[PDB]
Symmetry: C2
Amino acid sequence: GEVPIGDPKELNGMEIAAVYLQPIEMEPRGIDLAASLADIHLEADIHALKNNPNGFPEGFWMPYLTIAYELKNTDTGAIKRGTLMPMVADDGPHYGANIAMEKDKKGGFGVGNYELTFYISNPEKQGFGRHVDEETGVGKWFEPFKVDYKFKYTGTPK
Amino acid sequence: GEVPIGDPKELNGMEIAAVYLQPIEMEPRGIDLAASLADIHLEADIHALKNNPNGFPEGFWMPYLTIAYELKNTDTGAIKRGTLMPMVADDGPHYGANIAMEKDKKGGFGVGNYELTFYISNPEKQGFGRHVDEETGVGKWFEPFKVDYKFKYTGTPK
Ligand SMILES: [Zn+2]
Ligand SMILES: [Zn+2]
């Protein structure tokens, strides 16, 4: 199951949605938390809107983004942070991370009320280039920004 | 104002076409050869085919590839190698490099018959993941490969 986290935002020429899923078995091994040690996969779905000012066609996945996350259980105060990594599934690329929830004994990450924040930086931080000549050039990149979501976490999708 | 280089190749779930155009100005600075030192901008246009085996939607740009090129003037025997870098223009993302031809201080890269080779490695080299679970997983990435083109360079179009 895919559970939507809050409502998707249209910001800075992109549609930015958050969902969580069952833990994802991913390769290459070692880069991310193993699926068996996780309770969910947190995903950011980020695609260009129409009239994207940085030259991305409508619907294209936005690549080379840096996406940090903060996940807060507002009931318990438990907080965890990390970064999502780029990967591909049978239905296309996304940003994601396996996350231990109930499995994490270092904090109160069980069923409850959560706040999720993404801190998103533009592709130039990873060295992705942009044409700036008059003939082929595009608009300047957005400055780093945050999007916030509130959701109820009800357990690993079933 | 793109000049086609040879015939496009379809392999490993991708269409791989090459074009050149006038030199472009890229940010961030100090990575790509400066436009004034160049004669052309070489581009690799790489998009998913139908039924891409790694889950990329048809038409999507293929991101996180490592791509080198070798360019050989078959008339003079002059050969140069470099890297293509990911970037976005007003027509979307591509891999490209500004290249000195007539302006190459070594000489031998003027108007003539050329062989161009791309050497391409998969996204895992750059930390890109893939789902491997039964429900949403995708197959292995291609091993490093090359594709070859033949074309006539008719001079700097700047
Ligand atoms: Zn994933
Ligand atoms: Zn370019």
